[PDB]
Every structure is written in structure tokens, then in C-alpha cells.
Amino acid sequence: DLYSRYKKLQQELEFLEVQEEYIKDEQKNLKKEFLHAQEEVKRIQSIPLVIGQFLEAVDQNTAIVGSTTGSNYYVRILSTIDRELLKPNASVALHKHSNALV
Amino acid sequence: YLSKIEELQLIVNDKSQNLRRLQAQRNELNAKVRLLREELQLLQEQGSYVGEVVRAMDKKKVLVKVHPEGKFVVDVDKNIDINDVTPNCRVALRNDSYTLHKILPNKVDPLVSLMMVEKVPDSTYEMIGG
Amino acid sequence: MSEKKQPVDEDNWDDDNVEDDFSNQLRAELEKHGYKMETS
Amino acid sequence: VIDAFRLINANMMVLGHEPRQTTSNLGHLNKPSIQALIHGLNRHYYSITINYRKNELEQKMLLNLHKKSWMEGLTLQDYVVKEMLELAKNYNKAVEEEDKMTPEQLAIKNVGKQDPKRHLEEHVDVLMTSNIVQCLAAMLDTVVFK
Amino acid sequence: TRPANHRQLTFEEIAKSAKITVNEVELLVMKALSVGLVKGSIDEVDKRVHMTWVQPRVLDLQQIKGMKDRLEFWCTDVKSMEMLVEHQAHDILT
Amino acid sequence: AHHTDCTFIRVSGSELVQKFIGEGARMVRELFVMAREHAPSIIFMDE
Amino acid sequence: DKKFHGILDQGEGVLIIFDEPPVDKTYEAALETIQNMSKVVDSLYNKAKKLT
Amino acid sequence: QAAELFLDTVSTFTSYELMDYKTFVTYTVYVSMIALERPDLREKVIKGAEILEVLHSLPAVRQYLFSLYECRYSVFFQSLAVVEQEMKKDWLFAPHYRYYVREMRIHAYSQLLESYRSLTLGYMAEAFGVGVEFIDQELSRFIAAGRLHCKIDKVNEIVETNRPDSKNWQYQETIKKGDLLLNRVQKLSRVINM
Amino acid sequence: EKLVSKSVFPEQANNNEWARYLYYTGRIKAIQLEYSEARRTMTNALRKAPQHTAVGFKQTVHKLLIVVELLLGEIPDRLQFRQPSLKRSLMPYFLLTQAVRTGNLAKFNQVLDQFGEKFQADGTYTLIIRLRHNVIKTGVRMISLSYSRISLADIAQKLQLDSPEDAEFIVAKAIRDGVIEASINHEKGYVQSKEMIDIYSTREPQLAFHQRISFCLDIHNMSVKAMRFP
Amino acid sequence: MAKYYTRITMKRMAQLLDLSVDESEAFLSNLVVNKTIFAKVDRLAGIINFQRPKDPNNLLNDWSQKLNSLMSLVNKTTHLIAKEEMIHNLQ
Amino acid sequence: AVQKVVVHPLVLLSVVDHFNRIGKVGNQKRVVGVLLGSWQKKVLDVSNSFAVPFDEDDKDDSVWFLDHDYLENMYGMFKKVNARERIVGWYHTGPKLHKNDIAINELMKRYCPNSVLVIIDVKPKDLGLPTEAYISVEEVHDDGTPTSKTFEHVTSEIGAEEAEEVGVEHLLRDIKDTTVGTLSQRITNQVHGLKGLNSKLLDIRSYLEKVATGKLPINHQIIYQLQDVFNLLPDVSLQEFVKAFYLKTNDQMVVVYLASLIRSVVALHNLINNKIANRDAEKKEG
Lengths: 102, 130, 40, 146, 94, 47, 52, 194, 230, 91, 286
Description:
This is part of a larger assembly, with eleven protein chains of ten kinds. Helices cover about 50% and strands about 5% of the residues of chain D. Chain D is built from eight helices and two strands; from the N terminus they run βαααβααααα. Chain D has helices at about 10-15, 25-30, 35-40, 55-70, 85-100, 100-110, 125-135, 135-145, and strands at about 5, 45-50. In chain D, strands 1-2 form a two-stranded antiparallel ribbon. Chain I has two domains: about 25-150, no CATH class; about 195-225, no CATH class. Helix content of chain I is about 65%, strand content about 0%. Chain I has twelve helices and no strands. The interface between D and K is large, with 52 and 62 residues. The PDB classes it as hydrolase/inhibitor.
């Protein structure tokens, strides 16, 4: 059945190449989504931000801070900001709605 | 040989599946980075207030003073036991229902700077003289 | 993967190029070059 | 942020508030779910799903007026380019020269235990896009004009 | 009237143009240049003009230069080259 | 302090707290409470 | 050494005294390429040892 | 390396290997000028406090060291000949006697040429030895070696100048490092690529 | 026939095999009088020698490169590589390189007779036989780099030409190929030998210093090839 | 003196400056004391090259020409529609 | 006056919605509405607008009706919603301007002291922007054209709004530098090469066509004056632009080289990052 097997192997390559195109096409679509989401992370920072003072970091991705109002809040630190800057109380911009460390 | 060696040529084309695995890994890798941005939708949620527990009572009720306001009785969350709550502990009160979201440490006044444990002084036991 | 095949067919270097350049020359040893200028 | 709400009658409370003949639409309705403040006053009201009405030419005119208009699309003159570029290219390359030291550290490091090495400094794409687009001004130099 | 090429002209033609002697035109071209009604670049190698900005009161004839003699014909050439950019990188356009 | 294996607290500061406009019992009551949190602790006083 | 910053400016009739020798690209690339190739040398050691 | 490690002129003590501190100085001046740039030569040897007394003792060493800095080309060429006899006679300096003299001649030729883009060979003769042909033959051989970074001319009898490294040799400097740098990657990729 | 037989296989997975192909391909060009292409091929072949090739092996590859460069007339000193086994076979070539620099034919003749053996074993002895005439070319190349506008009589003194007319004949040979335009006046100008001008990596070499970058930038293919392997 | 001219004679410029050619170098030293700039004059050819002093990269020259030539083209197109409409007004 | 005419996006959509509202009758062939905007400065910005019922007739373009009541009542109610809002002009579709427009303009001039006409096209095409700005004024032409009363083109822009493309752009969008120089150059060549040629072609055709139907090939000073400004570059033969040699050509090489030399360095960083990424990280048999 060598003649039949030649057709069977040929079919396997044809199916694989047909599928191979799909992965690249979806991957390109994912690249566009990554850029759009990255812009959204930049967007939260741009809106007017209430001034705040860092107080303590309970854990990575979270912090305890006192704003100009002074009320202490369990805010979430943004991933992009360098962690070393966060440790000194210094001053941290807070998103008005989130209160997060923008 | 024409129909028994041409099938062998299709075996050469089998290596494209190995390339498909490499691209499949990239599809997952891109998915992971975008999923991290989907995780960043969490940053939108409002932060819970930070308050100190004056004392605890039974039936999942704790007396916690808000930092700029007044005493509030709060319902403890399932994650933290009433036993875990203690007097003079800086818990987090939920933004809407004032619930006990979590227990936060570092409940200490300016004296923390005085600790001076960090940046331990240069080793000098050998440098000391007689 | 030794080729083989073709067997059938500073401390002592670096200055070798410089030495080769004037190995034939420097018979004057510089002092004669000065004497040649004196004759000139 | 806009959301749409319709009240539910107290008499209707005994009856099921919203019988569903279609599971998928309820699932789409489920995706918004409820807001914590809305949950506080949710009783006596039911959230109703809101979707953009079909937009075709309306979508097309804003679409035409987005990249061409809302974003910069002069097109006749859409294509600094050679004045401050030399400063930007030197500055990013200088940042890379300092940044590349972290990758040099990773290769030298035995790294038996995995540790962050500040790699993926990248900026290679940023340099590539800036140098190539400015080099594409050659098309303006000898083709778009004379 | 002439953009480049014929715009550049000998001092003697300017001498005829200013109705003055060629030796005199070396002095005369400077006086004509002095009026500086139109900002331009002038080379005194042959007193050739090849200058920059000029304001014509009106275009000569039927604006023949404006037709395929200068404009339009060059624009037709550009779009064919634009097609060459598309052919060079059709996949990139996506 | 370098060769300790214990929390080292340095309290050579004078009185800014207590009944002044500052804070209450910070120099002593608070310092001991922080030392309680870190059980192996040594406090160095310079006055 | 330092001076007018013009080499033998005796012939010209227009004058050419100027010095412009600090292009950042030449210096920054020359340093980075030497430093980058150090990764190439080090990477060879890491890969070769695992390879054999 | 010796000129750098002979920085300890201040404290050579009276080492037995040195016949005298005076001998150590004669070696340090001889070794440093070959390997020292003009900014270092003024800072370390011409303005050197300890070396100056020792060169006060030796008139020849003082004239030879001073002439290169003073740009007294005629005196140094004669002085270099006196140095050659001493270098050949000296043990531990005889093996490189030829390299020292020619390298000094290359450094001397570079110094006067750096100032002028155009130099008549007659002018070079006036600065150095009188014979024009002898400067010309050294010029051609040094130019051939790649030393003297200049292009000679005949009949016009004017020596011109070569391109600056910053002006255009920066491209050459990137390519020279690049050729070895690129060559490494070509060989390396094959080993993992197999 | 081998040149026509040449096909694809740029994979060169062995790499040593590519050096082996290059070593003969360079040999073919050297015997075919394409010395300039051959030296580059030999250098590429010399670089790909992972195996020790310590005795009588790499030395043969080195021998071909040095002879072809000498055939070009550019003089390569042996100090750059100088492998000890290359050195044992290089006692002839090294003296021959000194002989090429020297104007003494008798020294070259002594080297040819005394060291004819071993070079004949290498099989590059025929290249040495052609090199005997090539000694004159080395001097002219030195003159072209050294003098922008040398006198015709001076060229006659430098290369010891018997007559000025013989020197003019040598100047026509000097133009040859791959050297700066002589642009000889044939009168007062003599060997003007004017060098290329405006070679400042500016507009005149704008193709010159941009083409060099294109090749290195083309090697960015390595990022695509390795990325494919996972 | 500036102007856009290129090969105007330096001796003629001295005559235009109303000072003697023999003492012109001293008279032009007055220009040096004024230190107005060095627009450039080639005395070897006896020509004042008063067009450009110290040549920088001509990056702006392409940028300004490109911005203006393109801007004039849209301006021409924007006016073009009105005139085309006027022929259509009678058509 | 009317130095620039920014049109808010909400108004730009409003014209299209009206065309659909009257889409049942295609006889009108245009949409006419009162245009309300604020003259905060010389810049004119159009804001919320309403459409007055109007009929345009092919019979001599004299049968035109504008309802005084609709214009007055709606404007007053809309002004009650926005104090800043005021009549600033009128908007019409029908890209070719009808002769009747000037008569409608006179009524528009009466309602607003410095009113403007925006010829927004409900069906968008390609190039430029949808709105066309025309202001009709009466003056004596310097050359001496009789009457000299005509609409004059003015610069037009798009207004700024928030959360407006969530309805539309969310489906697509391309806000990145990835497509810069990949397709952006293609669009400019696509339009400057063809659309710029088309307007010049209209004038080149006008050399005989303007004689045949156009006002005049030798007319409207800017026909030659603006074209001569466009011909800042000579246009033919020597040119002295890219043929400068020592000037622009030498500079083009210096910048292209400085830009190119980074790419050789750029390749080095990218290639070695791939070698560590695949040669070491992929090769982990364990």
C-alpha cells in the first residue's frame, strides 16, 4: 500500500501546513492586543491623580498609603514602577477612583 | 520506486510540525503577557480602608476604628479567623461594607526608623584593639 | 574530525616583522647615517 | 460607565423575576454581573443588558475620521526627522551601553540558582523603527519630489 | 519664466537684458540684484540665476509649464513608483 | 551590631515625644514593644 | 596640543579653523561592541560546557 | 610596562641591581619617551621633580629628553646616535637596540608632520640632517610600514597628511572591531546549529 | 569540472567539510590565476579549523594563503600566525619572503635551489615558479601606497629598471588592475599615479561606507535561523 | 553686505565699502572689530563669497522645502475644488 | 474671520443620522441643517446642531424654503440647553455646491453675523477630511471681476470628545509605531501621487477645459500664484535640489550612514539575544 501511504503522508503535511498558517495569524493578532493593553496601563496614570504618601508595603503588588486626605488605604502598586522607589515614603500619585499607587 | 520513494519525500516535510510546535509555544507566550494585562484589570478595584482593631467580639464581629473617622463594627471575611484578629492590629476594612479584607502588619510609630537594624554597621570585632 | 590528509604534502617574535624590514639594512648602525649627513 | 436598569415589581417577586428561554444571552448578561454599590440597592430592580446598536456607515465615517482625522492622517503630508533624531539615537544607544552590562553579568554569572538579571532591556525595536523610518525619507528625497 | 537650467544664464545675456555693456554688467548685475524684490540664490560665475523664491505677476501663455511640460507628468511618474513600493512590500502592508 | 544574629535597635535620641507636642511613650514604651516583636533583640542607648 | 585648532591654515583664502571630533555614535558603539562581544565569549563557555 | 612600573623613581632606595639611582633614571627616561605620549611626557618626565636633578648630572640625557619636547629635531637626531652606542654596549638594552632607534625615529617623524599638512622635504632636512635623500628614504620606508601616517610626493617635493580617525576612520574603527566580532558569531552559530 | 559540479549544500553542517571544500576551491582558483579570490577563500578556510591540525596539516592551508598573497605582490609577514609546524616548512618561504623584499635575484635563486624540496611536496612549487617574475610587482605596489605622484626616473631607480623607457613600460604594467589610476601625463607629469581623491567615507565613498554596513546588517539572518531551531 | 550673491568681487566689495584696496585688510579689520560674522570672502580669487557663513547640516533645507511644497499642494487642491465647482456652476 | 472651523465629532455623525432619517426620500439629494457652534476665538468650533426642514428644487434653484419657526423654536430650546451654543452657520450634504447655496447663504447671513457653510459629505470617500468649509462674502475683485460675491474656502478640523469611539473604534484601531513606515508611506504615495496629480490634472485639463467650461485658465491669481509657490522647487532639468552634490547629497550620505551604522550595532544586540534564547534556553535536555 506504498501508493496509498504516499497519499496519507501527503495529507498529513497538507493538514499541518494549513494549521501552521493559523498559529502565525493568531499570534500576530495577539501582538496587536498586547500593544493595546500596554497603552491601557499607560492610560490609568495620565488621568488627574490625587497626591499621596507611601507608608508600608504589606506585600509585592499591594501597599498601605496615606493620601492628602490622609486616610490610610489598602492600595495596589502598579507593576511598572520600580519597587526601590516605593520603599521610602516619598510621594506617590493615587488614581482618583482606584486610590492605587499610579 | 516512483510511488514508494515519493512518500519518503513527504517524510522530509514532517519537520514542519516541529516548527509548528515552536510557533505554538510563542502563541502561549503572547497569551501569557496579554493575560498579565487582563490581570491588571484588578488595579481598577477600589482599595479597602486601613483601620486598627480596638478589640474583637464573637459571631464574626470586630470593633475597628477607621483611621480618620470613628469606631465601626465589621463582619470578618471567611479567609481570616476571629482568633487571628487581635487588639492593636492594623486590619483592612472593605471600601463598601467595611469587611475584614486582610490583616496588615507594620503597625508601628516613627520609632521604626530608630531600629537602625538595616545597613548593619561595618564588622569591627577584629578592628577593636586591646 | 582531524583533517590529516596533508602530511604527505617579543620573546622571539612580533619584532620579527620590524627586524625583517631592516635586517638587510642598518649596516650603517645609525652612526654612519650621521656621518653621511656630515659629508653632505 | 453607563449602565441600564429596570425596576422589578414587589408583586412579581413571588414569580421568577426573569425566566430565560435562551442560555447564551443569560451568559452574556452574566458577564457584567453586579456592582457592589448597585448590589446594595439591587433589590426591587433588575439590571438589563445594553449593547451598541448596529453601526455601519456611522462606524465607517468615524473609522475614516479616526486614523485619517482623530489620529494624524494628513496623508497628502502625513510623512525633527533629521534634526533631533541624532540626539535621540545617541541617547538610546547610551542607555543600551549601560543596560547591556546587565546581560554581560548574566552570561558571566554561574546562575546555578535562577535570579533576575535585568535582561530584555530591548530598545532594539525602538532604535530599529526610528532609524528605518528616517532612512525611508530617501523616498521623499528622490521619488516623492523629483 | 525658466526654473533651473535656462534660469541659469550668461552675464552677457543679463548685459543685453539690462541693455548695458558686458563689462558694465559686472557692476550692473549687482545693482539689479540689490533691489532684491524676490529672495533667491545668485552665482556670479556666469551671473547664472538658479535662485529661490520669485513672484510672477501672472503665468506666461496658458501655463504650459503647469501641464505635462513640468507638473502633472512628474506626478504620474510618482504613483508608478508608489506601486513599486507596494510591489516591494505587499505582505508588510497587510 | 554586625556580629549579632539578633535584632539591633539604636535609641541614642533625646526626648521629642512624651508630653511635648510630639507623641506619647514613644522613646520607651514603643521601643520595648518593637523589641518584643523581634524576640532576639539588643537596644543600645548612648545617653 | 591645544591651540588655534587649525592644522597649517596658510593656504585657502577663505580660512578653515574648526574642530568637530566627538560623534557619540562612534564612541558609544565602539565601547558597546567590545562589551557585547564579551557576552559572545562568555556565552560560548556556557553553551560549550553543556554541549560537551 | 617598564615605563609604567618605573613610576617608583621616588623610592628606588639604592637597589643593588641598579648600578646607581643615576642608571635607573637613564633607563627610565630612555624607556618612557618611547612609550609615553606628549601629555604624559611633560607631566611625568619633563616636569618630573626627581628626574630633573638626575638629568642635571648627565648633559646628554638632559639634551636628548629635552630636545624631543622642545621640538629640537636637529639636536635629538645627533643625541639619538650617542644613545644608540650606549644602548648596544649596555647589557639588557642591546637586544632591542634597533627597535628603540627606529621607533624613536618614527615618533620624531610623526611629531613635526602632525603640525603641518604640507611639508617641503627641504624643510624636513633643515629641521633634521642636511641630506634631503636620507630623510626621503626613511620617509618612504616608514610610510610603507604604515608608520608616519602620510603620503609622500615627488617633483613637487611636498609631504601631505593622512585622514583623521575621528573624521572618517571612525567607520574603519567600527569595521576593524566588527570583522573579528562578526567572524566569531559565524563560527559560533555552526557549533550549536550542527 | 569541479567548478561546474559545484551545486548547493550551504548547510556545511561539518564546517570542517566546508573548509576542505574551500581549501581545494581556493587551490583551483590559485592554479587558475584567480589569486585575489583565492586568498580570501583560503583565509575563510583557515578560520574554520576546529581540529588541532598540529603537524603537517593546518600548515598546508597556511602555505597556500601566504604564497597567493605573495603572488598578489602585497607582502605578508609571517609574524601574525607563525604556527611552529608551519615554521618548520616555512624556513624556505620565510627566506623567500625576505628574498622578495630584497633586490638580489641571487638570494632568490639560492632559496629556490636550496628550498625547492618540500615546496614541490606541497604542490605549490609551480606557484613559486610564477612568483619569480612577480618580484617586480611587489615594489610597484609599495611605490603606489608610498608616493602619490612619483617621478618616472625615480621609479626606474627604485625598481632598478635598466632604462627610463623600460620604466615607462613597467608603469603600463603597474596600472595592471585593482590599483589607483596612473593618469600618466606621458610627459612632465611622468608617473602621476594620482590616488583616488575625496575617499573620506563621504559622498565619493557614500556607496563605499554604506555597502559595508549592508553585509553586516544582512548577517542579522542569524537571529532568524536560531529562532527557527527550538 | 550680506545678500544672496556668491561670486561678487572682493576688490569691488572694498570699492562698495568705500575704502582703499591697499589698506582694505586694515579696513576689513574694522569688520573684524565689528565682529558682525564671517559670511566668507575668497581673497585668493578676489571675490566676496557673501552667501553662507559656516555650513551646518542642511536638514532644515529639505524639511522646510518638503513642508512648504506639500503645504502649497494641499492649498492648491483646496482652492482647486472651488474653481472646479465654479465651472460646474455654469455646468 | 472664520480663521479655522473645527467640527465636533458628534455634529459630524449628526449630519449622517439626518441623511438616514430622510433616507426614505432620495429626491432631496442633500441634507440641510442649522449649524450651532461657539465663536470662543477666531477658531470656530461647531457643537450640537439640529436640521431645519428644507427643499431644493432643480427649477432654477429658486424654489427654496427654510422654516422660520423651526429655526427659531429649536435654536431657542437648544440655547436653553447650552448658553455657549449659538447659531454659527449651516451644514449641507450634496458635495457639488448648488447655485441655490448663495441664496440660502444670504438668509444664513441674516441669522448669524459671521455664519459659515460646512459641506459635510454623509458618504465618506478617501483623503483630507469629510467637512468642507465655505464662507460667502461680497467684495470688489482687485483685477475687476463683476460682483465678486462667492463662497471662500476656510481651514476645517475635527473636534475633541471622550468615550466616543468606544461605540466604533473598539472593534479595530491601530495605535502603535509598528505600522509607521510600513503602510504610512504607502498612503502618502497613494494620495500625493494620485490625488495631488488629480487636482493638478484638473488645472492641466483646464488649460483647454477652463477655456471650454472653467472660469478661465488665466484666472484666480492663486491658480498661478499658489502653483508657483508649489513650484518653490524649479520642477524640471537642473533643479539644484537633490542634484546639489556637495550640499544635500553629501548630507544625505552622512545621516544615512549615521543611521545605518547603528543597524550593524543593532544587529549585534538582537543576534546575541537570540543565541542565548535558543542555543542555551531551548537546549535543556535535563
